Enzyme design. Structure first.
Site, PDB file in Angstrom:
ATOM      1  N   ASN A 127       0.819  -1.191   0.000  1.00  0.00           N
ATOM      2  CA  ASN A 127       0.000   0.000   0.000  1.00  0.00           C
ATOM      3  C   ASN A 127       0.872   1.268   0.000  1.00  0.00           C
ATOM      4  OD1 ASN A 127      -2.520   1.350   0.142  1.00  0.00           O
ATOM      5  ND2 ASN A 127      -2.373   1.542   2.359  1.00  0.00           N
ATOM      6  N   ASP A 129       5.613  -4.828   2.676  1.00  0.00           N
ATOM      7  CA  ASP A 129       4.344  -4.288   3.218  1.00  0.00           C
ATOM      8  C   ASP A 129       3.192  -5.293   3.124  1.00  0.00           C
ATOM      9  OD1 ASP A 129       3.173  -1.431   4.024  1.00  0.00           O
ATOM     10  OD2 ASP A 129       1.825  -2.243   2.435  1.00  0.00           O
ATOM     11  N   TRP A 130       2.026  -4.958   2.586  1.00  0.00           N
ATOM     12  CA  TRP A 130       0.968  -5.930   2.420  1.00  0.00           C
ATOM     13  C   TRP A 130       1.343  -7.004   1.420  1.00  0.00           C
ATOM     14  CZ3 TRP A 130      -2.424  -6.991   5.802  1.00  0.00           C
ATOM     15  CH2 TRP A 130      -2.773  -6.018   6.753  1.00  0.00           C
ATOM     16  N   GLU A 138      10.867  -4.435   5.034  1.00  0.00           N
ATOM     17  CA  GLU A 138       9.806  -3.609   5.628  1.00  0.00           C
ATOM     18  C   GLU A 138       8.450  -4.335   5.573  1.00  0.00           C
ATOM     19  OE1 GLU A 138       9.162  -0.462   7.151  1.00  0.00           O
ATOM     20  OE2 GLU A 138      11.166  -0.846   7.943  1.00  0.00           O
ATOM     21  N   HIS A 153      10.151   3.371   4.971  1.00  0.00           N
ATOM     22  CA  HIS A 153       9.340   2.205   4.607  1.00  0.00           C
ATOM     23  C   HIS A 153       9.572   1.735   3.176  1.00  0.00           C
ATOM     24  CE1 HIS A 153       6.330  -0.748   5.330  1.00  0.00           C
ATOM     25  NE2 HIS A 153       5.414  -0.245   4.538  1.00  0.00           N
TER      26      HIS A 153
END
Ligand SMILES: [Cl-]
Ligand SMILES: [Cl-]
Ligand SMILES: [Cl-]
Ligand SMILES: [Cl-]
Ligand SMILES: [Mg+2]
Ligand SMILES: [Mg+2]
Length: 292
Positions: free
Chosen positions: A39, A104-105, A128, A270
């Protein structure tokens, strides 16, 4: 300068009635390297990493449902929605064994897929990634008020849906170097229409923080336990100060995860791929043949 172009031909596949876009470059056969964004990004996030890997290996980088150049069904875009569409994407392409490159996702999706299909994952490169954040105390202060607001009834939708705060705010605030306007326009393009920002709002509301939502906390705990007990080769990139994976966490994981290499990319928050893509790409390329 870090590259701003996206020189990949679009590929499309029908998945659960919806068209999904993906990058598909490199050799046409052999073990593919599957790149999974999160995201509020797309396959664009991988644009400067893929060229290091494509000389040796097939590279597949889908746009998650509702994101990038993929179709926009009228979904709630919970994690389970993404699980369903990515599972069906992988089957639609007939993938067998894969190497995962995840963030991330995309990392929650990848690790969850690996736990369920452990014989089909040859290696995992990650950065991350999503782990349970037991208290707000462990969410780094500089982004804490934002994510708390993202997760608050009405306020979070005003920010993310009405004002595009994930794209215009959080994204550049999670890259150490400044993003250029060309880069921002690539990231903006799928979300010019506010209603289309539903995935961008649901994702932060799915993050496993302070025990909620409990189903996601359980799912993430489950794959972290799987990852601690798996002999799969692992390559972990980390930055300073990081966001989800601060330096001290990366160092703990280097000891606790089996068969894990860690690579320090230098400054990073990130979206590490936007700060040091050349090191990430070149190190993945150097590591792949070792999965032998
Ligand atoms: Cl570059
Ligand atoms: Cl371009
Ligand atoms: Cl709401
Ligand atoms: Cl540093
Ligand atoms: Mg349809
Ligand atoms: Mg809430």
């Amino acid at each position: 300068e870090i590259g701003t172009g996206f020189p990949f031909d679009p590929h499309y596949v029908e998945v659960l009635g919806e068209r999904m876009h993906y990058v598909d470059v490199g050799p046409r056969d052999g073990t593919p390297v599957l790149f999974l964004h999160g995201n509020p990004t797309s396959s664009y996030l991988w644009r400067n990493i893929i060229p290091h890997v494509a000389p040796s290996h097939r590279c597949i980088a889908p746009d998650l449902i509702g994101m990038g150049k993929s179709d926009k069904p009228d979904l709630d875009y919970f994690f389970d929605d993404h699980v369903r569409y990515l599972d069906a994407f992988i089957e639609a392409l007939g993938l067998e064994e894969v190497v995962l490159v995840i963030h991330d996702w995309g990392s929650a999706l990848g690790f969850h897929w690996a736990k369920r299909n452990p014989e089909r994952v040859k290696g995992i490169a990650c950065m991350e990634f999503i782990r349970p954040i037991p208290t707000w105390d462990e969410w780094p202060e500089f982004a804490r008020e934002t994510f708390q607001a993202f997760r608050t009834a009405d306020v979070g939708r005003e920010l993310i849906i009405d004002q595009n705060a994930f794209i215009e705010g959080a994204l550049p605030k999670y890259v150490v170097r400044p993003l250029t306007e060309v880069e921002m326009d690539h990231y903006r393009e799928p979300f010019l229409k506010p209603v289309d920002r539903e995935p961008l709002w649901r994702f932060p509301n799915e993050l496993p923080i302070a025990g909620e939502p409990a189903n996601i906390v359980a799912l993430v705990e489950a794959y972290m336990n799987w990852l601690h007990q798996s002999p799969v080769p692992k390559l972990l990139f980390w930055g300073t100060p990081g966001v989800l994976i601060p330096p001290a966490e990366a160092a703990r994981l280097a000891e606790s995860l089996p068969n894990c290499k860690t690579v320090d990319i230098g400054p990073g928050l990130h979206y590490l791929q936007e700060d040091n893509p050349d090191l990430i790409g070149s190190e993945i390329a150097r590591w792949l043949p070792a999965l032998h």
